[PDB]
Structures are given as structure tokens and as C-alpha cells.
Coordinates of C-alpha atoms in Angstrom, one line a residue:
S23 CA -0.6 8.2 -32.3
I24 CA -3.8 5.8 -33.6
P25 CA -7.1 6.5 -32.7
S26 CA -9.1 3.9 -30.5
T27 CA -12.8 3.2 -31.3
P28 CA -15.0 3.0 -28.1
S29 CA -15.9 -0.1 -26.7
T30 CA -19.7 -0.8 -27.4
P31 CA -22.4 -0.5 -24.6
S32 CA -23.1 -4.6 -24.3
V33 CA -22.4 -6.5 -20.8
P34 CA -21.1 -9.5 -21.9
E35 CA -21.6 -10.7 -18.1
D36 CA -25.2 -11.0 -18.9
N37 CA -23.9 -14.6 -21.0
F38 CA -21.8 -16.1 -18.4
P39 CA -22.9 -19.3 -17.1
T40 CA -24.0 -19.5 -13.5
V41 CA -23.3 -21.6 -10.9
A42 CA -25.1 -23.4 -8.1
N43 CA -26.0 -21.5 -5.7
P44 CA -26.5 -23.2 -1.7
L45 CA -28.8 -20.7 -0.5
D46 CA -30.9 -20.9 -3.7
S47 CA -33.4 -22.8 -1.7
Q48 CA -33.8 -19.9 0.9
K49 CA -34.3 -17.1 -1.9
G50 CA -37.8 -17.1 -1.3
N51 CA -38.1 -15.2 1.7
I52 CA -35.3 -12.8 0.9
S53 CA -35.7 -11.0 3.8
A54 CA -35.2 -14.0 6.3
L55 CA -31.7 -15.0 4.2
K56 CA -30.6 -11.3 4.6
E57 CA -31.8 -11.5 8.4
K58 CA -30.3 -14.8 9.3
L59 CA -26.9 -14.5 7.3
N60 CA -26.4 -11.3 9.2
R61 CA -27.3 -12.4 12.5
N62 CA -24.5 -15.4 11.6
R63 CA -22.3 -12.1 10.5
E64 CA -22.7 -10.2 13.5
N65 CA -21.7 -13.3 15.7
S66 CA -19.0 -14.4 14.3
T67 CA -15.8 -14.7 16.8
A68 CA -13.4 -12.6 14.2
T69 CA -11.0 -10.0 15.1
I70 CA -10.6 -6.6 13.9
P71 CA -7.1 -4.9 13.3
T72 CA -5.9 -1.9 13.8
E73 CA -2.7 0.0 13.3
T74 CA -0.9 0.6 17.2
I75 CA 2.3 2.0 16.1
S76 CA 3.5 5.8 15.6
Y77 CA 6.0 7.4 14.9
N78 CA 4.9 10.5 16.7
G79 CA 6.4 12.5 14.0
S80 CA 10.6 11.5 14.3
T81 CA 10.7 10.2 10.9
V82 CA 9.9 13.5 9.6
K83 CA 10.6 17.4 9.2
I84 CA 8.4 20.0 8.9
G85 CA 8.9 23.9 7.8
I86 CA 7.8 27.3 9.7
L87 CA 8.9 30.7 8.2
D88 CA 8.1 33.3 11.4
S89 CA 9.3 36.3 13.0
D90 CA 12.2 35.1 14.8
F91 CA 14.5 32.3 15.6
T92 CA 18.1 33.6 15.5
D93 CA 18.8 34.6 19.4
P94 CA 21.6 32.7 20.5
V95 CA 20.0 32.0 24.1
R96 CA 16.6 31.0 22.6
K97 CA 18.4 28.8 20.1
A98 CA 19.4 27.2 22.6
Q99 CA 16.3 26.3 24.9
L100 CA 14.7 25.3 21.9
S101 CA 17.6 22.7 20.7
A102 CA 17.4 21.4 24.5
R103 CA 13.4 21.1 24.0
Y104 CA 13.0 20.1 20.4
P105 CA 16.0 17.4 19.7
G106 CA 17.1 17.4 15.9
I107 CA 15.2 20.9 15.0
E108 CA 17.2 23.6 12.4
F109 CA 17.8 27.0 12.5
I110 CA 18.0 28.7 9.0
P111 CA 19.8 31.5 9.2
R112 CA 18.3 35.3 7.9
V113 CA 18.6 35.5 4.1
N114 CA 18.9 39.6 4.7
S115 CA 20.1 42.0 7.2
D116 CA 15.6 42.0 8.8
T117 CA 15.8 41.7 12.6
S118 CA 12.6 40.8 14.8
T119 CA 12.5 40.6 18.7
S120 CA 9.1 39.7 18.5
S121 CA 7.9 35.7 20.2
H122 CA 4.9 35.2 17.9
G123 CA 7.6 32.8 16.0
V124 CA 8.4 30.7 19.5
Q125 CA 4.9 30.7 20.4
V126 CA 4.0 29.4 17.3
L127 CA 6.3 26.9 17.4
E128 CA 5.3 25.7 20.8
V129 CA 1.8 25.1 19.8
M130 CA 3.1 23.0 16.5
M131 CA 5.4 21.0 18.6
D132 CA 2.5 20.3 21.0
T133 CA 4.3 21.5 23.8
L134 CA 3.4 20.8 27.6
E135 CA 2.5 23.6 29.6
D136 CA 5.6 23.2 31.5
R137 CA 7.3 23.9 28.6
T138 CA 10.0 20.1 28.8
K139 CA 9.5 19.0 26.1
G140 CA 6.8 18.7 23.0
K141 CA 4.5 15.0 22.6
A142 CA 5.1 15.9 18.8
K143 CA 8.7 14.8 17.5
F144 CA 9.4 16.0 13.9
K145 CA 12.5 18.0 13.3
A146 CA 11.0 21.7 12.9
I147 CA 12.9 23.9 9.7
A148 CA 12.8 27.1 11.7
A149 CA 13.0 30.4 9.3
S150 CA 13.5 33.8 10.0
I151 CA 11.1 36.4 8.2
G152 CA 10.3 38.9 10.7
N153 CA 11.3 42.3 10.4
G154 CA 9.8 44.7 13.3
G155 CA 13.1 45.5 14.6
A156 CA 13.8 46.1 18.6
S157 CA 10.2 46.4 19.4
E158 CA 8.9 43.1 20.9
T159 CA 5.0 44.0 19.9
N160 CA 5.9 44.5 16.5
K161 CA 5.2 41.3 14.5
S162 CA 5.7 42.8 11.3
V163 CA 7.0 40.0 8.3
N164 CA 9.0 39.9 4.7
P165 CA 8.4 36.8 3.3
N166 CA 10.2 35.9 0.1
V167 CA 11.4 33.1 -2.3
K168 CA 14.9 32.8 -0.7
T169 CA 14.3 32.2 2.5
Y170 CA 11.7 28.9 1.3
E171 CA 14.5 28.0 -0.8
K172 CA 16.7 27.4 2.1
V173 CA 14.2 25.2 4.1
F174 CA 13.3 23.1 1.3
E175 CA 17.1 22.3 1.1
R176 CA 16.6 20.6 4.5
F177 CA 13.8 18.3 3.5
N178 CA 15.0 14.9 2.7
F179 CA 14.4 14.2 -1.0
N180 CA 12.5 11.0 0.2
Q181 CA 9.6 12.6 2.0
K182 CA 7.2 12.9 -0.3
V183 CA 4.7 15.4 1.4
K184 CA 6.6 18.7 3.2
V185 CA 4.5 20.6 5.1
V186 CA 5.2 24.4 5.6
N187 CA 3.7 27.1 8.3
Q188 CA 3.1 30.0 7.7
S189 CA 1.4 32.0 10.8
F190 CA 1.3 35.4 9.4
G191 CA -0.7 37.0 6.4
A192 CA -2.3 40.6 4.6
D193 CA -5.0 41.9 5.9
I194 CA -6.9 42.4 3.0
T195 CA -9.1 39.0 1.8
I196 CA -8.6 37.1 -1.2
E197 CA -11.4 38.5 -2.9
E198 CA -10.5 42.0 -2.5
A199 CA -7.2 42.0 -2.9
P200 CA -6.4 43.7 -5.6
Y201 CA -4.9 41.5 -8.4
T202 CA -6.4 38.8 -11.4
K203 CA -5.5 35.7 -12.2
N204 CA -3.9 37.5 -15.2
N205 CA -1.3 39.4 -12.8
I206 CA -0.8 37.6 -10.0
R207 CA 2.2 35.8 -10.9
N208 CA 4.0 38.9 -12.1
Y209 CA 4.4 40.0 -8.1
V210 CA 7.7 39.5 -7.0
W211 CA 8.9 39.7 -2.8
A212 CA 11.4 42.3 -2.2
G213 CA 15.0 40.9 -3.2
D214 CA 13.6 37.7 -5.0
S215 CA 13.6 37.8 -8.8
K216 CA 10.8 34.6 -9.2
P217 CA 7.1 35.8 -8.4
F218 CA 6.5 34.0 -5.7
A219 CA 2.8 32.4 -7.3
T220 CA 5.1 30.8 -10.0
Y221 CA 7.3 29.5 -6.8
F222 CA 4.6 28.0 -5.1
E223 CA 3.3 26.4 -8.4
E224 CA 6.5 24.8 -8.4
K225 CA 6.4 23.6 -5.0
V226 CA 3.1 22.3 -5.0
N227 CA 3.2 20.3 -8.5
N228 CA 6.9 18.9 -8.3
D229 CA 8.2 19.0 -4.8
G230 CA 5.1 17.5 -2.5
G231 CA 4.9 21.2 -0.9
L232 CA 1.8 21.6 1.5
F233 CA 1.5 25.2 2.3
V234 CA -0.6 25.8 5.8
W235 CA -1.6 29.5 6.4
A236 CA -3.3 31.2 9.0
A237 CA -7.4 32.2 7.9
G238 CA -6.8 36.1 9.4
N239 CA -8.0 37.0 12.2
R240 CA -9.3 41.0 12.5
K241 CA -9.6 43.5 9.5
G242 CA -7.7 46.8 10.3
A243 CA -6.7 45.7 14.2
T244 CA -4.4 48.0 15.5
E245 CA -3.1 47.9 19.4
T246 CA -6.1 49.9 20.4
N247 CA -8.7 49.7 18.0
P248 CA -9.8 45.2 17.3
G249 CA -10.5 46.3 13.9
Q250 CA -13.7 45.2 11.5
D251 CA -14.9 41.5 11.0
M252 CA -12.8 39.5 8.1
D253 CA -15.5 37.7 6.5
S254 CA -12.9 35.8 4.0
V255 CA -9.4 34.4 4.0
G256 CA -6.3 36.7 3.8
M257 CA -4.5 37.1 0.4
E258 CA -2.4 34.6 1.0
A259 CA -4.3 31.8 2.8
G260 CA -6.5 32.3 -0.2
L261 CA -4.0 32.2 -3.0
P262 CA -5.7 29.1 -4.8
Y263 CA -8.6 31.5 -5.6
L264 CA -6.0 33.3 -8.1
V265 CA -4.0 30.6 -9.2
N266 CA -5.9 27.5 -9.0
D267 CA -3.3 24.5 -9.3
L268 CA -2.1 25.8 -5.9
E269 CA -5.2 24.3 -4.3
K270 CA -4.1 20.9 -4.4
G271 CA -1.0 21.8 -1.7
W272 CA -3.1 24.5 -0.1
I273 CA -4.5 24.6 3.8
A274 CA -6.4 27.9 5.4
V275 CA -7.5 27.8 8.7
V276 CA -9.8 29.4 10.9
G277 CA -9.1 29.9 14.6
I278 CA -12.0 28.8 16.6
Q279 CA -12.9 27.7 20.1
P280 CA -12.9 24.1 21.6
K281 CA -15.4 25.3 24.2
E282 CA -17.1 28.3 24.1
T283 CA -15.3 31.1 26.5
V284 CA -15.8 34.9 28.0
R285 CA -13.3 37.7 28.1
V286 CA -12.3 37.6 31.9
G287 CA -9.3 40.1 32.1
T288 CA -6.1 41.4 30.3
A289 CA -2.7 40.4 31.2
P290 CA -0.5 43.1 31.9
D291 CA 1.4 41.9 27.9
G292 CA -1.9 42.3 26.3
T293 CA -2.6 38.9 26.2
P294 CA -6.6 38.0 27.2
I295 CA -7.2 36.0 30.1
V296 CA -10.8 33.9 29.4
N297 CA -12.9 31.8 31.1
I298 CA -14.7 28.7 29.7
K299 CA -18.5 29.7 29.4
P300 CA -20.8 27.8 31.7
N301 CA -22.8 25.3 29.4
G302 CA -21.0 26.6 26.5
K303 CA -21.1 25.2 23.5
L304 CA -18.5 23.8 21.4
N305 CA -16.2 24.4 18.3
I306 CA -17.0 27.9 18.0
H307 CA -16.4 31.4 16.4
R308 CA -16.0 33.8 19.4
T309 CA -18.5 36.9 19.6
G310 CA -18.5 40.4 18.2
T311 CA -15.0 42.4 17.7
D312 CA -13.4 39.0 19.0
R313 CA -14.4 37.0 16.2
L314 CA -11.9 35.9 14.0
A315 CA -11.8 35.2 9.6
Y316 CA -14.2 33.3 8.3
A317 CA -13.4 30.9 5.4
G318 CA -15.8 32.8 3.3
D319 CA -17.8 31.2 -0.1
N320 CA -14.4 30.1 -2.2
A321 CA -11.7 29.1 0.3
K322 CA -14.0 26.9 2.1
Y323 CA -13.3 24.6 -0.1
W324 CA -9.6 24.3 1.7
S325 CA -10.1 25.8 4.9
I326 CA -10.7 24.2 7.8
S327 CA -10.7 24.6 11.9
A328 CA -8.6 24.6 14.6
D329 CA -8.2 25.6 18.0
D330 CA -7.0 29.4 18.2
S331 CA -5.5 29.6 21.7
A332 CA -1.6 29.6 22.1
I333 CA 0.2 27.2 25.3
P334 CA -1.1 29.4 28.3
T335 CA 1.8 30.7 30.6
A336 CA 0.7 31.0 34.3
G337 CA -3.2 31.1 32.6
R338 CA -2.7 33.5 30.5
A339 CA -2.7 32.6 26.3
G340 CA -2.6 34.5 23.2
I341 CA -5.1 33.8 21.2
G342 CA -5.1 33.9 16.7
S343 CA -5.8 32.3 13.7
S344 CA -1.7 31.9 14.1
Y345 CA -2.1 29.5 16.9
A346 CA -4.6 27.1 14.7
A347 CA -2.4 26.9 11.6
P348 CA 0.2 24.8 13.9
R349 CA -2.2 22.3 14.8
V350 CA -3.0 21.8 11.4
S351 CA 0.5 21.6 9.8
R352 CA 1.0 18.9 12.7
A353 CA -1.6 17.0 12.0
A354 CA -0.7 17.2 8.3
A355 CA 3.5 16.5 9.2
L356 CA 2.0 13.5 11.2
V357 CA -0.5 12.2 8.3
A358 CA 2.0 12.2 6.1
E359 CA 4.3 10.4 7.9
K360 CA 1.7 7.6 8.8
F361 CA 0.1 7.1 5.0
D362 CA 3.9 8.3 3.5
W363 CA 2.9 7.0 0.0
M364 CA 0.2 10.1 0.2
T365 CA 0.1 12.3 -2.0
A366 CA -0.4 16.3 -0.4
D367 CA -3.3 16.5 -1.5
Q368 CA -4.8 13.2 0.1
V369 CA -3.7 14.2 3.1
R370 CA -5.4 17.6 2.9
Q371 CA -8.9 15.2 2.0
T372 CA -7.9 13.0 5.0
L373 CA -7.7 16.4 7.5
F374 CA -11.2 17.9 5.6
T375 CA -13.2 14.1 5.6
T376 CA -12.5 13.3 9.3
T377 CA -13.2 16.9 11.6
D378 CA -15.6 17.2 14.1
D379 CA -18.8 19.4 13.7
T380 CA -19.4 22.7 15.0
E381 CA -21.6 24.7 17.4
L382 CA -22.9 21.8 19.4
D383 CA -24.1 21.3 22.6
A384 CA -22.1 21.2 25.6
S385 CA -23.4 18.0 26.4
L386 CA -21.5 16.3 23.7
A387 CA -18.4 16.8 25.5
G388 CA -16.1 13.6 26.6
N389 CA -14.6 10.8 25.3
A390 CA -17.8 8.6 25.2
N391 CA -19.2 10.9 22.7
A392 CA -16.1 11.7 20.7
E393 CA -17.7 9.8 17.4
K394 CA -20.8 11.8 18.1
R395 CA -19.4 14.8 17.4
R396 CA -18.3 13.8 14.1
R397 CA -19.0 16.0 11.1
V398 CA -21.1 14.1 7.9
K399 CA -21.7 16.8 5.6
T400 CA -20.6 16.5 1.6
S401 CA -19.4 20.4 1.6
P402 CA -17.7 22.6 3.6
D403 CA -19.4 26.3 5.3
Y404 CA -18.1 29.9 4.9
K405 CA -18.0 29.9 8.8
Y406 CA -15.6 26.9 9.7
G407 CA -14.5 25.3 6.0
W408 CA -14.6 21.2 6.6
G409 CA -14.9 21.6 10.1
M410 CA -13.2 21.3 13.5
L411 CA -9.9 19.3 13.0
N412 CA -9.5 16.3 14.5
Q413 CA -6.0 14.8 14.7
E414 CA -6.4 11.7 16.4
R415 CA -9.3 10.7 13.8
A416 CA -7.3 12.3 10.7
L417 CA -4.7 9.4 12.2
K418 CA -6.6 7.0 11.1
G419 CA -6.9 7.5 7.6
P420 CA -9.2 9.2 5.4
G421 CA -12.9 9.9 6.5
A422 CA -14.4 10.3 3.1
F423 CA -14.1 9.2 -0.5
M424 CA -15.8 12.5 -2.6
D425 CA -14.4 15.6 -4.2
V426 CA -13.3 18.4 -1.3
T427 CA -12.1 21.1 -3.9
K428 CA -13.0 24.0 -5.6
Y429 CA -10.9 23.7 -8.7
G430 CA -10.7 20.2 -8.8
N431 CA -12.1 17.0 -8.2
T432 CA -10.7 14.2 -5.7
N433 CA -13.9 12.2 -6.3
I434 CA -11.8 9.1 -6.6
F435 CA -9.3 8.1 -3.8
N436 CA -6.3 6.8 -6.0
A437 CA -4.4 4.6 -3.1
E438 CA -1.1 4.0 -4.3
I439 CA 0.6 1.9 -1.7
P440 CA 4.0 0.1 -2.3
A441 CA 5.7 -3.0 -1.9
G442 CA 6.5 -4.0 1.6
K443 CA 3.9 -1.0 2.9
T444 CA 0.4 -2.0 4.7
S445 CA -2.3 0.6 5.4
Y446 CA -5.6 0.5 7.8
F447 CA -8.3 3.0 7.0
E448 CA -10.5 2.6 10.3
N449 CA -13.0 5.5 10.2
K450 CA -16.3 5.5 8.5
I451 CA -16.0 6.6 5.0
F452 CA -18.9 8.0 3.3
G453 CA -19.1 9.8 0.1
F454 CA -20.3 9.9 -3.6
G455 CA -17.4 8.8 -4.8
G456 CA -14.6 5.5 -4.2
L457 CA -11.7 4.2 -4.2
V458 CA -8.9 2.9 -6.6
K459 CA -6.0 0.6 -5.0
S460 CA -2.9 0.3 -6.7
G461 CA 0.9 -0.5 -5.9
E462 CA 1.9 -3.5 -4.7
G463 CA 1.4 -2.8 -1.3
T464 CA -2.0 -3.5 0.9
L465 CA -4.4 -1.6 2.4
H466 CA -7.2 -2.6 4.7
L467 CA -10.7 -1.4 4.9
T468 CA -11.5 -2.2 9.0
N469 CA -15.0 0.1 9.5
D470 CA -18.4 0.0 8.3
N471 CA -18.2 2.3 5.0
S472 CA -21.1 3.8 3.1
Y473 CA -19.2 5.4 -0.4
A474 CA -21.1 5.0 -3.2
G475 CA -18.8 5.3 -5.9
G476 CA -17.3 1.1 -5.6
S477 CA -13.7 0.3 -4.9
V478 CA -11.6 -1.4 -7.9
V479 CA -8.3 -3.4 -7.1
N480 CA -5.6 -3.0 -9.3
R481 CA -2.9 -3.9 -7.3
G482 CA -1.8 -5.3 -4.2
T483 CA -4.3 -6.0 -1.8
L484 CA -7.3 -4.9 -0.5
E485 CA -8.9 -6.2 2.8
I486 CA -12.6 -5.6 3.7
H487 CA -13.4 -6.4 7.1
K488 CA -16.8 -5.0 7.5
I489 CA -19.4 -3.3 5.9
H490 CA -18.4 -1.9 2.2
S491 CA -21.8 -0.6 0.7
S492 CA -20.9 -0.2 -3.0
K493 CA -19.7 -2.4 -6.1
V494 CA -15.9 -4.3 -5.7
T495 CA -14.3 -4.7 -9.0
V496 CA -10.6 -6.9 -8.4
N497 CA -8.8 -6.1 -11.8
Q498 CA -6.0 -8.8 -12.9
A499 CA -3.1 -8.0 -11.0
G500 CA -5.1 -7.1 -7.5
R501 CA -6.2 -9.2 -4.6
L502 CA -9.4 -8.7 -2.4
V503 CA -9.3 -10.6 1.1
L504 CA -12.8 -10.7 2.8
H505 CA -12.8 -11.5 6.1
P506 CA -15.6 -12.7 8.4
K507 CA -17.6 -10.1 9.4
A508 CA -17.3 -8.2 5.4
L509 CA -20.5 -7.3 3.5
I510 CA -20.6 -5.8 0.2
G511 CA -23.9 -4.2 -0.7
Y512 CA -25.8 -2.0 1.4
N513 CA -28.3 0.4 0.8
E514 CA -26.9 3.6 3.4
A515 CA -27.2 7.6 1.7
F516 CA -23.5 8.4 0.6
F517 CA -24.0 11.4 2.6
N518 CA -24.9 9.6 5.6
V519 CA -21.9 6.8 7.7
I520 CA -23.4 3.9 9.0
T521 CA -24.6 4.2 12.6
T522 CA -27.2 1.0 12.9
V523 CA -27.0 -2.3 10.5
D524 CA -30.5 -2.9 9.7
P525 CA -30.7 -6.2 7.6
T526 CA -32.7 -5.2 5.4
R527 CA -30.7 -2.4 4.1
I528 CA -28.2 -5.5 2.8
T529 CA -28.9 -5.0 -1.4
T530 CA -29.4 -7.8 -4.2
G531 CA -27.9 -6.0 -6.9
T532 CA -24.6 -5.0 -5.9
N533 CA -22.0 -7.2 -7.4
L534 CA -18.0 -8.4 -7.1
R535 CA -16.2 -8.3 -10.3
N536 CA -12.9 -10.7 -10.1
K537 CA -10.4 -10.5 -12.6
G538 CA -7.7 -11.2 -10.0
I539 CA -7.5 -12.8 -6.8
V540 CA -10.6 -13.0 -4.3
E541 CA -9.2 -14.8 -0.8
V542 CA -12.1 -15.9 1.7
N543 CA -12.0 -16.2 5.5
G544 CA -14.6 -17.9 7.8
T545 CA -18.4 -18.7 6.1
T546 CA -20.1 -15.4 7.2
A547 CA -19.1 -12.7 4.5
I548 CA -21.9 -11.6 2.6
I549 CA -22.3 -10.2 -1.4
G550 CA -25.6 -8.2 -1.7
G551 CA -25.5 -9.1 -5.3
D552 CA -23.5 -11.2 -7.5
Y553 CA -20.0 -13.2 -7.3
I554 CA -18.7 -12.6 -11.3
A555 CA -15.5 -14.4 -11.6
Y556 CA -13.8 -13.9 -14.6
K557 CA -10.6 -15.7 -17.1
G558 CA -7.8 -16.1 -15.5
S559 CA -9.3 -15.6 -12.0
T560 CA -8.6 -17.2 -8.5
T561 CA -11.1 -17.6 -5.6
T562 CA -9.2 -19.1 -2.6
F563 CA -11.3 -20.0 0.2
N564 CA -9.3 -20.6 3.3
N565 CA -9.7 -23.6 5.9
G566 CA -13.1 -24.6 4.6
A567 CA -14.3 -20.5 4.1
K568 CA -17.6 -20.1 2.6
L569 CA -19.0 -17.5 0.9
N570 CA -22.5 -16.1 1.0
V571 CA -23.7 -14.5 -2.4
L572 CA -27.6 -13.2 -2.3
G573 CA -27.6 -13.0 -5.9
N574 CA -26.0 -15.5 -8.9
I575 CA -22.9 -17.1 -8.9
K576 CA -21.2 -16.3 -12.6
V577 CA -17.9 -17.6 -14.2
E578 CA -16.8 -16.0 -17.9
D579 CA -16.5 -19.6 -18.9
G580 CA -15.2 -23.2 -17.6
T581 CA -11.7 -22.6 -17.6
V582 CA -12.4 -20.3 -14.2
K583 CA -11.4 -21.7 -10.8
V584 CA -13.4 -20.8 -8.3
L585 CA -15.3 -23.3 -5.9

């Protein structure tokens, strides 16, 4: 072990010789030059690629622990409805007749109203922990590590992120739970020898476990009493508060309404019947004693909202955070499948940074407004967490590079993509943070991005198709491909997404540093700053390609091959 000296502040690039810039004659009017370059860029006919293929879950498994999946009739129905479903035999003598588990599973599988099939094709690992006996209205559960161990055995070792749904939890908020950070790891569920907190730490830290929990409904509700407001997540949903290293593999799920409803009856079962409120708001909590749990001011960092409705049968539908959690579990499993190189934490960030905003005017409904509904905020809130889940947007990859956590720092997104894999990030990505591309595979940024922390290409390929607001650095083993509409250096605030291109906002100090490979296509790509090529670097122009550098072109020495 030998100490290192810190590097003296110097910027050697200040001494790099410059290369003649063809645009130099036009630089007397920088505004006009920006305008012309941008016009040419916008009129380019280059196409923007998209990933069109989806496996729809078919290549992965997903866990669920709920009331009961052991009834032989039910099993046969579920086996037919969801090909490849696996059932875990009970680990103890508990029994349950509650259909809560099945109702949660239906949502998780994206089941059609007619119950013929699910749109999601992942293989559920369905475990039974209900203990309410012969009473079917009794939803009580008895979780244990023994069951979890059996669930995790069914996951393929090669499945990097392993999503598990938990639509159950304590009738107590995390902050009110009678435990401390010093004693939380002393508690064992009945029958276990391993404390649950310790178990969950192992799963999250070593096994890519991603645990999705219903945030909670009401406090102290009974069959006849709607109980009180629950103003923070339940104990298990909020466990990272007491065990910080769980956060990276934890999501609490607040139940909300896609569209504001009004109560219009109760089925013989006790099940609600509601109507769409005329001109109702979008993505909003319920009113009065119908209102479900808030995330609260701590857990909001690992919280997200989703639709709180079960799959309707004959116009009646159960309501609860129990039905919101499985939607998040499903979206997480699908995102993990598509971006199978992501860590569990990167999947959480993907979901959190692609949500829709909450309590929106009814006029924002409809497909034409899908992007207008996007939440663009750099922090979560105590009611909704990171906002309303959007599975479709999540599947196009992260929507912000920034810290999304209470206890960590996810400012830098470390995209490690292996050889033979290509991924497309197709959303507009905002945020204070930035991107580090590693592994031998390829990442495309296909949209107008406003994140401020820059991109570093350490290995494999990064491809830029449109605006990249902040600086870009290609290191020695990295490769950057610039497409005709690429623009590096654009003055957008880190907390906004780009919604109009204004040429006046093209910068003159945002630099592209190349110590590896830069490949240029078209004649219209722009660097709003300097192009700096270092010893050992390659600059390749495909078929007469040109790069428009608004700053200076610099080379480390005469050995560098650029133009």
C-alpha cells in the first residue's frame, strides 16, 4: 500500500495547439452562425432509431408472497391462465381462504377483464403466507424468511434483478414503529432463526433483490370502521428508514386513482362500486375516509404511486395499495428484463424518473397529451412519492440522471452494458447528475437531454442522436458516435426538459474531449464549445462527414489523427 499525490490543478489543454476551424470566418456573428447551423441540423433527414422489440416478461420470473395459492382448483385455473407459474408449498401449518393473493396476482400479470390470460408473460413464483383460516374475509398473513428462501431458489442465477411483490404490511407507520436503528436487526419472524432485516440486507446487497411493498391503506380500519388517515408508509414498506442499505432495493407503493371517482354503491361482498367523477382530476388520492396512505417525509424517496384498483368483475373492484404494488412490481420486472444489465437500484431510478405528474386537470387526458402529463421535478413529495407510475415511459429507460435517494447518492448513472448488448434510452433525460458508460456494449441516447453532469465514455459505445446539453468526455477505451442531429452544448436548466429548440441557447463553452474514438455522421452535428483530441485518439468522418465546432479545435500534439 503506497499513497498517491493529488494532481496539481493545471489544465494542460490550455497549451494544446489549435487546428484551423472552417467556421472561423462566420464567428463575427455568433448568433447567426448558431441559427444557420441549427437550421441545417433540424432540416437533416437522418432517422432516429427506436427499440421496437419487447419480450413482455417471458424471459424472467417474479415473486409474490400473499394470502393463498394452494387451493387445487385455483392452482389449475392459475396454471392455465398464466403459463409457467410456480407455486411454493407452505413452509408451516398456516391456512387461508382469502382470495387477496389471487386478486393481487391478477393485477401483477396484467390480466384481461375476461380472465382469459395476462398481457405480462413473466413466470410468477407464488408463495402462501396467509393464516386467516376458514374465514375468507380474514386477510391476515405470517411472513417468514423460510418462505422467502424458497421463493429465491426458483430465480435463475443469471437473472440480475429479482423482483418480489408484497401487498401486505403492518398497521403502523415506519416512524411510529417501536424499533430503532440499533435494535431493528434483533427481530425474527415466528419460526425463523435469521432476523428479517438481516435477511433483506443480504438479498438486496448480494442477490439483486428488489422488494416492492404496498405503502398502506388506513390506520386501525375494521370491517365496520374506516379507521384514521395514515400519513406515512407502513413499517415494512418504510424499513430503509431503520436499515439504510435496504433503500437501493426497496420501493413503497402509494395507491391513487388514474381518474378521480365518486362512491356510488357497495356490492353484496363489501366491494366498492364507484363512478368516474365528471371532469375529475387525474392521478389523485381519494377523499375523506377513503384516502390511502401518504409516503410521508422520509419514505417519499423510495415511494411511487400507482392505480389502486383490482381488476374489475361485473363492475365491482377492490380498492387498495395492495393493487398499486403489483403494477410497480410488474413495471420493475419488465424494465429489468429489457435493460438486463441494470442493477435493482437503476431499475428503481428508471421507474422514479419516468412518472406522470399528479392532481392534473381533466383536460390533460388522452394519448395526444401523454408527454404533457410527465412529471418533471427533482424531488419526490410526501403524498405521491416520485409521482404516478408510467410503465410505458419507464420501458424507454431512465428519465433523469440525479440523486433520487434519502440515504445514498445516485447522481451518476453507471451504465455497464456487456458485449453484444445494445440499449436505447429514448426519453428526455433531465437532472443535475450525469452518465458514465462502461462495459463493451452500446448505449444510444435518442432524445433531447438536459442533464447537467455530463457524459463519460469509459468503454464500449455511446451514440448521441439529438441534444446533449452538458459536456462529453471519451476516454481511451471508449467510443462516441455522433449522428447528424447531435448537438453537444445547450443551455437548458437541469430541472427542465427541452420542449423547444432555441438556437440562442447553443453554448460556446461546452467541450467534447476525445481520448478514444469519435465517429461522425452527416455534416450537421454541432459542438457548442471546443473539440479537444488527445494523444492516441481517433476521429473518423464517415462518407464525407463534417463536425461543426463553435469553439476551438485542439490537439494534444502532431501525432493525433483527427481531420
